[PDB]
Amino acid sequence: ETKCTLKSFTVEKGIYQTSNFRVQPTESIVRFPNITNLCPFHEVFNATRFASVYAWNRKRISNCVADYSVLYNFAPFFAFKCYGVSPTKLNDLCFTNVYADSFVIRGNEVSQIAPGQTGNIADYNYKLPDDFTGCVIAWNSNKLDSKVSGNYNYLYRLFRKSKLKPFERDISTEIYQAGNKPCNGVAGFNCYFPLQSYGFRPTYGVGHQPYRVVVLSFELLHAPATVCGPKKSTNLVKNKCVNFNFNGLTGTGVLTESNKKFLPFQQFGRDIADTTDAVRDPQTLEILDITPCSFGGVSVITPGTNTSNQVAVLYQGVNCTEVPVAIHADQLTPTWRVYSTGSNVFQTRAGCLIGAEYVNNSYECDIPIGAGICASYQTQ
Amino acid sequence: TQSYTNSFTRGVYYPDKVFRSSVLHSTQDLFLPFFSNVTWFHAIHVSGTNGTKRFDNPVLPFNDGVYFASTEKSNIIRGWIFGTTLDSKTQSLLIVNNATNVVIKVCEFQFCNDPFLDVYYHENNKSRMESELRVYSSANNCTFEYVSQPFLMDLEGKQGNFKNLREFVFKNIDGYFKIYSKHTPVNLGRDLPQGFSALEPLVDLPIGINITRFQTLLALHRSYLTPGDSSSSWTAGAAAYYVGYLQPRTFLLKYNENGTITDAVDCALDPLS
Amino acid sequence: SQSIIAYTMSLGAENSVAYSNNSIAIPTNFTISVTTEILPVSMTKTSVDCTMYICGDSTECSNLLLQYGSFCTQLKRALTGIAVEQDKNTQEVFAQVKQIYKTPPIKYFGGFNFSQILPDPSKPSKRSPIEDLLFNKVTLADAGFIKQLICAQKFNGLTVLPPLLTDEMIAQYTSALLAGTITSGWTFGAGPALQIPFPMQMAYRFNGIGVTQNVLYENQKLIANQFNSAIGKIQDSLSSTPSALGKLQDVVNHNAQALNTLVKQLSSKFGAISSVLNDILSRLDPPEAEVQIDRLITGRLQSLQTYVTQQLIRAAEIRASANLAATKMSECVLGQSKRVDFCGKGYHLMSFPQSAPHGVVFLHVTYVPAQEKNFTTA
Amino acid sequence: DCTMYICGDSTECSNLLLQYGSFCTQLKRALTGIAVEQDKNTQEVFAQVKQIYKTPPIKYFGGFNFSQILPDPSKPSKRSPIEDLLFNKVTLADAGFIKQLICAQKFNGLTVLPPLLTDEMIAQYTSALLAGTITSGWTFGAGPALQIPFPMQMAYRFNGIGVTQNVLYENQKLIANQFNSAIG
Amino acid sequence: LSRLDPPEAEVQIDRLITGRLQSLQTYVTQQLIRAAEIRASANLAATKM
Ligand SMILES: *[C@@H]1O[C@H](CO)[C@@H](O[C@@H]2O[C@H](CO)[C@@H](O)[C@H](O)[C@H]2NC(C)=O)[C@H](O)[C@H]1NC(C)=O
Ligand SMILES: *[C@@H]1O[C@H](CO)[C@@H](O[C@@H]2O[C@H](CO)[C@@H](O)[C@H](O)[C@H]2NC(C)=O)[C@H](O)[C@H]1NC(C)=O
Ligand SMILES: *[C@@H]1O[C@H](CO)[C@@H](O[C@@H]2O[C@H](CO)[C@@H](O)[C@H](O)[C@H]2NC(C)=O)[C@H](O)[C@H]1NC(C)=O
Ligand SMILES: *[C@@H]1O[C@H](CO)[C@@H](O[C@@H]2O[C@H](CO)[C@@H](O)[C@H](O)[C@H]2NC(C)=O)[C@H](O)[C@H]1NC(C)=O
Ligand SMILES: *[C@@H]1O[C@H](CO)[C@@H](O)[C@H](O)[C@H]1NC(C)=O
Ligand SMILES: *[C@@H]1O[C@H](CO)[C@@H](O)[C@H](O)[C@H]1NC(C)=O
Ligand SMILES: *[C@@H]1O[C@H](CO)[C@@H](O)[C@H](O)[C@H]1NC(C)=O
Ligand SMILES: *[C@@H]1O[C@H](CO)[C@@H](O)[C@H](O)[C@H]1NC(C)=O
Ligand SMILES: *[C@@H]1O[C@H](CO)[C@@H](O)[C@H](O)[C@H]1NC(C)=O
Ligand SMILES: *[C@@H]1O[C@H](CO)[C@@H](O)[C@H](O)[C@H]1NC(C)=O
Ligand SMILES: *[C@@H]1O[C@H](CO)[C@@H](O)[C@H](O)[C@H]1NC(C)=O
Ligand SMILES: *[C@@H]1O[C@H](CO)[C@@H](O)[C@H](O)[C@H]1NC(C)=O
Ligand SMILES: *[C@@H]1O[C@H](CO)[C@@H](O)[C@H](O)[C@H]1NC(C)=O
Ligand SMILES: *[C@@H]1O[C@H](CO)[C@@H](O)[C@H](O)[C@H]1NC(C)=O
Ligand SMILES: *[C@@H]1O[C@H](CO)[C@@H](O)[C@H](O)[C@H]1NC(C)=O
Numbered sequence A: 001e002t003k004c005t006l007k008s009f010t011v012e013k014g015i016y017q018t019s020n021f022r023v024q025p026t027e028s029i030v031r032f033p034n035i036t037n038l039c040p041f042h043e044v045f046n047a048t049r050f051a052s053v054y055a056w057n058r059k060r061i062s063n064c065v066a067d068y069s070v071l072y073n074f075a076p077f078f079a080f081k082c083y084g085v086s087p088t089k090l091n092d093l094c095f096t097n098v099y100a101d102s103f104v105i106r107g108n109e110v111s112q113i114a115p116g117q118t119g120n121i122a123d124y125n126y127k128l129p130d131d132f133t134g135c136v137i138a139w140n141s142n143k144l145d146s147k148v149s150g151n152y153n154y155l156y157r158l159f160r161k162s163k164l165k166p167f168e169r170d171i172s173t174e175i176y177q178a179g180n181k182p183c184n185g186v187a188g189f190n191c192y193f194p195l196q197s198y199g200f201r202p203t204y205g206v207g208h209q210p211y212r213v214v215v216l217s218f219e220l221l222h223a224p225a226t227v228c229g230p231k232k233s234t235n236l237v238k239n240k241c242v243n244f245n246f247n248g249l250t251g252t253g254v255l256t257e258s259n260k261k262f263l264p265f266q267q268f269g270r271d272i273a274d275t276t277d278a279v280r281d282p283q284t285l286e287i288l289d290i291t292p293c294s295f296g297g298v299s300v301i302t303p304g305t306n307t308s309n310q311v312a313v314l315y316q317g318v319n320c321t322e323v324p325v326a327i328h329a330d331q332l333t334p335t336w337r338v339y340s341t342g343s344n345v346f347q348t349r350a351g352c353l354i355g356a357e358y359v360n361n362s363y364e365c366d367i368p369i370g371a372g373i374c375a376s377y378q379t380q
Numbered sequence B: 001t002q003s004y005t006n007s008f009t010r011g012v013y014y015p016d017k018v019f020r021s022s023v024l025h026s027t028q029d030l031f032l033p034f035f036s037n038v039t040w041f042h043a044i045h046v047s048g049t050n051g052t053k054r055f056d057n058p059v060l061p062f063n064d065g066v067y068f069a070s071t072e073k074s075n076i077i078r079g080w081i082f083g084t085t086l087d088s089k090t091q092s093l094l095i096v097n098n099a100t101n102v103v104i105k106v107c108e109f110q111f112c113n114d115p116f117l118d119v120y121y122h123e124n125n126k127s128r129m130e131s132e133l134r135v136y137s138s139a140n141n142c143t144f145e146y147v148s149q150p151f152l153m154d155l156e157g158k159q160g161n162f163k164n165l166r167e168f169v170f171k172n173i174d175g176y177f178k179i180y181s182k183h184t185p186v187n188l189g190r191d192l193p194q195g196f197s198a199l200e201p202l203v204d205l206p207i208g209i210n211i212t213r214f215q216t217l218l219a220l221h222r223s224y225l226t227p228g229d230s231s232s233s234w235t236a237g238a239a240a241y242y243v244g245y246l247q248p249r250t251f252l253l254k255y256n257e258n259g260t261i262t263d264a265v266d267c268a269l270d271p272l273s
Numbered sequence C: 001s002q003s004i005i006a007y008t009m010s011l012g013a014e015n016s017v018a019y020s021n022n023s024i025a026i027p028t029n030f031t032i033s034v035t036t037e038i039l040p041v042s043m044t045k046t047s048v049d050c051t052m053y054i055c056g057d058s059t060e061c062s063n064l065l066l067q068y069g070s071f072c073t074q075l076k077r078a079l080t081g082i083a084v085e086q087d088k089n090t091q092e093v094f095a096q097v098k099q100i101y102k103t104p105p106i107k108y109f110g111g112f113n114f115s116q117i118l119p120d121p122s123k124p125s126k127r128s129p130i131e132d133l134l135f136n137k138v139t140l141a142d143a144g145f146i147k148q149l150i151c152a153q154k155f156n157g158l159t160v161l162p163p164l165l166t167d168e169m170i171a172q173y174t175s176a177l178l179a180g181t182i183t184s185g186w187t188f189g190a191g192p193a194l195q196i197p198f199p200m201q202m203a204y205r206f207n208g209i210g211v212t213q214n215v216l217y218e219n220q221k222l223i224a225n226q227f228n229s230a231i232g233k234i235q236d237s238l239s240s241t242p243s244a245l246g247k248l249q250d251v252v253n254h255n256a257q258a259l260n261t262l263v264k265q266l267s268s269k270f271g272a273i274s275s276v277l278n279d280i281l282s283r284l285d286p287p288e289a290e291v292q293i294d295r296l297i298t299g300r301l302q303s304l305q306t307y308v309t310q311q312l313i314r315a316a317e318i319r320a321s322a323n324l325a326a327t328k329m330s331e332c333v334l335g336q337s338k339r340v341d342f343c344g345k346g347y348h349l350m351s352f353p354q355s356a357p358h359g360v361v362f363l364h365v366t367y368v369p370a371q372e373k374n375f376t377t378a
Numbered sequence D: 001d002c003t004m005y006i007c008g009d010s011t012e013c014s015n016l017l018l019q020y021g022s023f024c025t026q027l028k029r030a031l032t033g034i035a036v037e038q039d040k041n042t043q044e045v046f047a048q049v050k051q052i053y054k055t056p057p058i059k060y061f062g063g064f065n066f067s068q069i070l071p072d073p074s075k076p077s078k079r080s081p082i083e084d085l086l087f088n089k090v091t092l093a094d095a096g097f098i099k100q101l102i103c104a105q106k107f108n109g110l111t112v113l114p115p116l117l118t119d120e121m122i123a124q125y126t127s128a129l130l131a132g133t134i135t136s137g138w139t140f141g142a143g144p145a146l147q148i149p150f151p152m153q154m155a156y157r158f159n160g161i162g163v164t165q166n167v168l169y170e171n172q173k174l175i176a177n178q179f180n181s182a183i184g
Numbered sequence E: 001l002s003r004l005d006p007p008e009a010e011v012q013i014d015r016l017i018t019g020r021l022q023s024l025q026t027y028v029t030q031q032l033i034r035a036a037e038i039r040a041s042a043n044l045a046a047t048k049m
């Protein structure tokens, strides 16, 4: 390894740093909430009376096991573009709350449902936030919503004083005060009705045919879980380097019982790194602790390679009643787990040294180690 | 009556729901600025055994949330209504408490102002006031409903000295009304005492409505201690009902060792701050 | 009755001289004074790991970082060189003598009293009272003693190596030099140490500055009393002052502040959806995950490079300070310096070294004139 | 200042720059440290004296001519002719005098702070050292200033290199003439 | 900002900000070295005085 870290077949006398060591996880655990009911997704997509844009129906979902893999054969899915949450990586997450909004619009305006877009529909009828996360699903609906005479069932607002805030409903049957005359319900000259039609006929081509859209808004944020995917939980192990899946929180380390005071409205613990420190058990409600596994650097002490081929390793800042003395396969990143580790063992303030015997003598030292400790080649 | 007072250092709540300890984390959020005015408000309806109409409960604008502070005997302050024009023209809310219930909802009530004043409302003799709701009279185009635990769980110290100060904060940022609340019975007579306390979130739910107006619901059927005067423009007068507005600010909170909050610094008050 | 007042700075007290044609001024008395001087010698060593810091235990991030080439082999050689320079800095200042000298058993130096600087065997650390006070007055942050709360929050590839020379054998060096300079004069700085009585050595030191030895040989008692009083009161001056060891404290604090900032920079989006790798891998899919991970990687590289960029300049400044300290130790301690305003203020006599956390402290002894009278000269 | 040099008075740009974390706290701390070091540099060089000495009223130093280095009372700035020539020779660009065309076009967060020691007490320090070194010899840098006639100090400085004082005491006129010619 | 919608205006402004940050770091990077050299010269001048 020393011959490999610097490109040469001869290494001179001294101490060199080669790589790092860290114990490996042994088993993996997953703990998700235990919900059995299946919340309904059929009727939200499958309904015949979706409301208009000026007043769109909202469906809120609660505790369930949402299987986001069966809805694909519910519609042609003309547009299935999703935001930050990956559409395929959606069956393995946990969300706080999920919402669905349902409405039908003109197809030409379908592209106008997006953050940072204005126009006609996006300024007076419906608005989306700039940092929205979720999905949208739009597909053609000219087969059903088509009248030979005229489809006067869907309306939209043309005239409003100011743009609305995102996610806001503004249903109102008022009269717009266009011009100077304060008209009081005449609805005649210079005072037009705020609502118009969506006359949909098969004669019109693409873009003018009605398009049916449904938007799903997620709540991926640090909060107690309500909706989770279909996964099977397992048992808890402690005092061992393991990998956890705490309610969508993936990581590794050692879990031990803690003495924190997590209030009923507190779910996660934090230090100054934006990394989690303490977690609450999803289905037992016990306060745990997280500690990263042991790790450190490796230094190789070797004399001249033309004098001998014996080396002594030094683990920095690791006190070796721990894994250096109890070494096993699939537990150390250096594959070379082939030292005795029961003989030639010394403890040093700069990490314990393996491969050297202490001698009470004192000379000028050749290879410095640290803390007033040096190493050298010596006869019997 | 109406009067002005100094808010001192009150109205700070846990911004996020994560744990911390011995940290001086700072945040930017809606807050009540230090050392502002809090404007008192009092509704006056009691006189002998005769009507004595009040015309109380005026309109109050609801901008950027509202901070609430009052000392009700048991449940004298009951509900709050939110909306616009309180008529069948634009939707409005309905928030009101019960013994152990809450029936907040979104609707389009034409009107519900039926105080039903009692000819013998004088509390010193009798305080007979039962089932005096007289609300949700009409509903035009309404489907939203919600029932759950009421916001307040009052406690009694067996005497009026430990008057509860029900500090509430209301906000409507993208829905999910925050009802940060805390019970601090340790008041002993002085308004807004020197000290420090925090607030915790309880409920969250999104609806969607502009809410450019705020009003309260009082026990007009049984009310007491309502003196009257022409106090206005930075004067004094017994109200026992405070209202404060909130603005976006930047705060520096010193989290306690245990995990609570001990001190806070406003970053836009003094150049020293 | 308290306020803030703004004024114009005054340079100093106004004074005038009475220069003429045939007037001279001669002092009739002297005064011995003892000053102090503090010099940093080294800073804390450190080592940073790219793999643990940039891409925490994630294979894909490490594979993506591998494509960049040798931007981390370069970031290890500089740190190793800094560590080697820091280790070498402390050797030049202290390791000047070849042997180690013992103080004589009986402590009588002709009235001079040296208990405040000689080692105290009663204490376990065998450090002088002034050395103990200097050690206690400076609060160390980290020393790398198998720590296994802020320091415990550095499981991000950041470690602090311990110095090769512990602060137990540095005191041995200080005692060796001090015993050599109080038992042999300056003769042990060139060749073999030669014994000489202390009064004769002090008489020769006075003769160096142009004052004949009879002054000492007739005012020995007064000179010893003044020396004892100055040595006694310098400790009180060091103890009662608000903050005298400011340079060492600044050196200690700068590295800690830089490390804290480097740790905190991990909590940055750098124009990404999130600042945690596990979520950004689980939520996303590999195509856009590569772009987001590249953003995070380039942000972390940019934040990491500045650390070593500033560390190099700080190491250069510390090396310059250490070279100055070594020169001062060679010249004021191992001999008498004729350089003006170099080894204390006034005519130089001798000096004593002391060890401080990450630095050295010099105790100069200086000669200053006293009340003077005029005379008429030709 | 980053918040104006980088994102000129734009709220969107400021909010988008806030995502980079603490990146301009260092760029301010380093510059403040540089300014503090610059202020400290000019104090060690000049502030070597404790008291501001004054030149004697009459000026007779045994034939030597110090009019070219000593301060000139006639000039309003009390600067020596050599100092005036040095000041006129160098054309300084900006010094922080409330500037309020290239300098006026650098209103992008780039400001030039003025030095703490204005260039009127530096001349006072220089005059103080000159008076103390020509009226008291070298003894005012070690303790209290002791007066001494200038020719005696001349003989002292000649004796310090290996030449006895009789050389000066017999060649005083020639030495003074040579010094005057050189300083002229 | 005027000729474009927020979505890709974001990435363009990121480009501009990162360019300006890179252009600004080098200024202080060189200023530190210049200050160190000036400090060394000032120390030499102080010793010479
Ligand atoms: C030189 O100065 C010293 C300063 O200490 C003088 O010593 C003092 O002398 C007076 C008068 O004899 C005593 O009362 C003091 O107690 C002495 N000081 C101490 C610390 O003991 C000394 O006398 C001076 N020499 C001359 C010749 O005047
Ligand atoms: C001078 O040396 C002597 C001993 O050689 C010191 O004398 C004692 O020192 C201890 C240490 O603090 C004191 O507690 C005693 O009161 C001292 N006794 C006497 C008779 O002086 C003395 O402290 C030394 N001088 C100084 C200034 O410390
Ligand atoms: C002895 O020297 C002192 C100063 O060291 C002289 O005191 C000053 O002399 C100047 C010369 O005229 C006067 O202008 C000052 O007013 C004097 N100072 C004070 C406080 O009066 C003193 O005159 C000298 N004595 C002799 C005889 O030369
Ligand atoms: C030497 O000192 C004398 C005064 O003692 C100076 O004399 C005059 O100085 C002014 C200053 O510009 C000249 O304009 C006069 O011409 C000088 N007159 C004489 C007779 O010298 C003299 O200038 C000084 N020497 C130098 C080189 O400046
Ligand atoms: C999950 O299992 C625990 C058993 O400890 C039970 O108490 C809890 O009620 C279960 N969750 C639900 C939602 O019923
Ligand atoms: C909904 O499903 C039913 C059968 O389950 C089907 O008859 C109907 O056509 C579907 N409607 C839509 C809009 O998909
Ligand atoms: C917002 O306030 C205006 C004030 O005139 C009101 O007309 C409007 O109805 C409010 N918005 C909603 C959605 O009610
Ligand atoms: C090592 O020693 C051998 C002789 O045994 C010599 O030939 C060789 O050059 C040496 N190599 C080094 C690197 O010193
Ligand atoms: C390190 O190991 C030694 C061996 O017994 C022990 O004395 C010491 O307490 C240990 N320290 C830690 C931090 O484990
Ligand atoms: C070395 O010294 C220790 C005591 O310090 C003693 O116990 C030991 O036997 C000696 N010899 C060794 C370690 O070979
Ligand atoms: C409150 O308002 C009044 C005027 O309405 C003013 O005199 C007073 O200074 C205000 N108080 C504060 C703290 O702003
Ligand atoms: C108030 O009204 C009642 C109802 O008629 C009446 O009996 C009473 O006299 C009135 N009060 C006064 C003061 O007249
Ligand atoms: C409110 O409380 C009263 C008394 O407990 C009860 O009769 C009434 O039903 C409650 N209201 C609702 C809506 O349940
Ligand atoms: C008080 O009210 C009661 C009704 O409960 C009534 O009988 C009585 O006459 C009233 N007045 C007095 C003075 O008690
Ligand atoms: C609202 O209710 C009224 C009943 O007066 C009815 O005429 C109207 O059509 C309803 N509107 C909606 C959108 O249900």
Ligand SMILES: *[C@@H]1O[C@H](CO)[C@@H](O)[C@H](O)[C@H]1NC(C)=O
Residues within 6 Å of the ligand: B258
């Ligand atoms: C904080 O915790 C300590 C021990 O963990 C306890 O003694 C103290 O009472 C706590 N402080 C409170 C509860 O305010």
Ligand SMILES: *[C@@H]1O[C@H](CO)[C@@H](O)[C@H](O)[C@H]1NC(C)=O
Residues within 6 Å of the ligand: C020, C021, D060
């Ligand atoms: C010194 O001697 C010169 C010689 O003429 C004379 O002009 C001058 O006045 C003398 N100095 C004093 C202070 O009298």
